Design a binder for this molecule. Structure first.
Ligand code: 2MQ
Ligand code: 2MQ
Ligand code: ZN
Ligand code: ZN
Lengths: 368, 368
């Protein structure tokens, strides 16, 4: 395969379906990336992640630089070998996570923070992602808190665009990385159209393999997120993938694809699965509720996953109530399979020209 | 298959190897039973338990009567259907576990205890094990604390023998149970030869499908446990299986087989795996130790398990240090596979008449 090739096979309105070909594999789009923040998709073996349909997983610069360490992982052969996932990996650049989880000192050079003193900069971020062996490298950005005033959003976006250029140059200076990995830029500008335009224009001038919509799913709500996507995605190059960072719930995914997004990542299926929340086509359910204690049905009536072929709601209820690890395993496998099935149904419906009908059917049932 | 048939295929000294045939499957002996106290072998799917080589697992009357409840499990189709294990299940009778984990009131009728008020008696125990759908039912006993005076051990053993008769009669009165399940009696008498003889004689007079050595691995130490087995196992009927309850470490298993034991159960491989302890043929290792942080070798150099085929000590070190669920999963799978491999090597070496050499080789290396 090539280092990177995105091909759009079919379209419906703003929605697209296609493939990204990379050296370690093919990614079907629209794609959902399970999140593997500490070099594991929590409670799943990599073979189980792949069995559910995933083509690519997400890793995090921030968590892995802290534990077990980027240099350590490189000495051990890179992240793919370390965790036993041989397919593409996208790594976030840090910076969302620094601001989210760290003590911190921000400057034009980057950010210094407390987990032991650490530092991130465009150059260091790109180098960490190299040491991990990431296939899709994210530019190092600033994720603008919500709400933001226009002045603060603009200052923040402009810094991010200067860091996007530094990210580009750092990646390109590293031949092995430039020849084997891809680089995505991240659009900022909060909820403001003009700032989003300026950011899109800056990123396209630099040129990236893919373009993320950053700065959303940070407190604004679905209506606002959708309003911003409505004008923001069309600003990005049409022939490159569009990645909505940190989204989201099933209905957020459907709506975002209707607005031109091709890639997603979210901890919701893994995290909330461990907490007892199971996704179903009739909406989410909380398996800990007493109403499931003697329910012999599978978590979801249609789901093809191994969990729903073999175990009842009653059993999984028992396991989660008891805090058994197998409860976390089964819930997480089902929720990640559900998300992959949603992405398959989206892909197939766009390929067949019936995605708008699918989105309406989906919503009427999910919210019934 | 028949309800129950034990056949001895080969012998070496006091050691035996053979099969127990039951309706739900064949059990190869000497056998190790992974423990599934809350209707799960912790952190493993039943298919993974079977892939490691297990033929039979252990369930507990005490835990399951509390959560999710014996009547509940019967209404849901029994324990095999509930947890997805279709092969034989042995259930302990409660009583070790009551004394261990419960508030309690003991009388000749049974025991009343605090988890909500609960009660166990020979009759109730056997009925719970029926409701669970156990294949091998344990008589309801009293596990004599260690150390015990001869008087207290004798009183306790005599009560247990009266409860063994009540257990027999309760099981036999229940036709479906008597026709499809097996019943094992449990020898008591602490460390005293004469009391062990009396107990063996009482149990054989009643007659059981198998005979457990109860009252050991409760603080006496390996030398003493082995001293007691030396005289106690020969007292039991030679043509029925001999089950050493709650044992144990790999070397305890080897020594006990040398003394005529055919079946074992222990939480050590599961529990200590979750705590970072991995079994290897060169002895146990604690994977959390810093010396493994960059060790690319598998947990054990010879082990055939899927964990050792795919992941390094360094990765598992990271996962356990981080408290990741996949760490518990991988450690537990390896430790249960190690135990099954030990039992296979024991079986094969007795079949080939070279078990005494195996036991010596094993020990020289394990303790090197
Ligand atoms: C859950 N919401 C959320 N919004 C994001 C925005 C950014 C963002 O604007 N930049 C970066 N680098 N990452 C983001 C992430 C993390 C993706 N796993 C976000 N997550
Ligand atoms: C770890 N040591 C230990 N000693 C046991 C003795 C009895 C015993 O004497 N009786 C019964 N019913 N169970 C025992 C158990 C529980 C087996 N999982 C014991 N476990
Ligand atoms: Zn499912
Ligand atoms: Zn292994």
């Amino acid at each position: 395969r090539p280092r990177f090739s995105f091909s759009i096979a079919a379209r419906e309105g703003k929605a697209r379906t296609g493939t990204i070909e990379m050296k370690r594999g093919v990614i079907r789009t629209p794609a959902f990336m399970p999140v593997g923040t500490a070099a594991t998709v929590k409670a799943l073996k990599p073979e189980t992640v792949r069995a559910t349909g995933a083509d690519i997983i997400l890793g995090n610069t921030y968590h892995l630089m802290l534990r077990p360490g980027a240099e350590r992982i490189a000495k051990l052969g890179g992240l793919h070998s370390f965790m036993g996932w041989d397919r593409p990996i996208l790594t976030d650049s840090g910076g969302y996570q620094v601001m989210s989880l760290s003590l911190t000192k921000q400057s034009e050079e980057g950010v210094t923070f407390k987990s032991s003193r650490h530092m991130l900069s465009p150059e260091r971020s790109i180098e960490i992602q190299h040491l991990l062996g990431s296939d899709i490298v994210m530019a190092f950005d600033e994720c603008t808190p919500y709400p933001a005033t226009p002045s603060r959003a603009a200052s923040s976006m402009e810094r991010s665009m200067r860091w996007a250029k530094r990210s580009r140059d750092a990646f390109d200076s590293r031949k092995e990385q430039a020849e084997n990995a891809a680089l995505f830029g991240i659009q900022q500008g909060s909820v403001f159209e003009n700032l989003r335009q300026q950011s899109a224009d800056a990123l396209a001038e630099i040129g990236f393999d893919g373009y993320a919509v950053g700065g959303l799913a940070v407190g604004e709500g679905q209506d606002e997120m959708f309003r911003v996507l409505d004008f923001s995605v069309p600003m990005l190059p049409d022939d490159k993938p569009h990645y909505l960072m940190g989204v989201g719930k099933p209905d957020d995914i459907v709506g975002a694809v209707e607005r031109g997004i091709d890639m997603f990542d979210c901890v919701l299926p893994t995290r909330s699965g461990r907490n007892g929340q199971a996704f179903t086509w009739d909406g989410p359910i909380n398996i800990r509720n007493a109403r499931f204690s003697e329910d012999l049905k599978p978590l979801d009536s249609e789901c093809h996953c191994a969990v729903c072929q073999k175990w009842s709601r009653a059993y999984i209820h028992h396991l989660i109530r008891a805090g058994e690890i197998l409860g976390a395993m089964l819930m997480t496998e089902h929720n990640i399979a559900f998300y992959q099935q949603l992405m398959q149904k989206i892909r197939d419906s766009i390929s067949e020209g019936r995605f708008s009908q699918f989105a309406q059917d989906f919503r009427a049932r999910y919210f019934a």
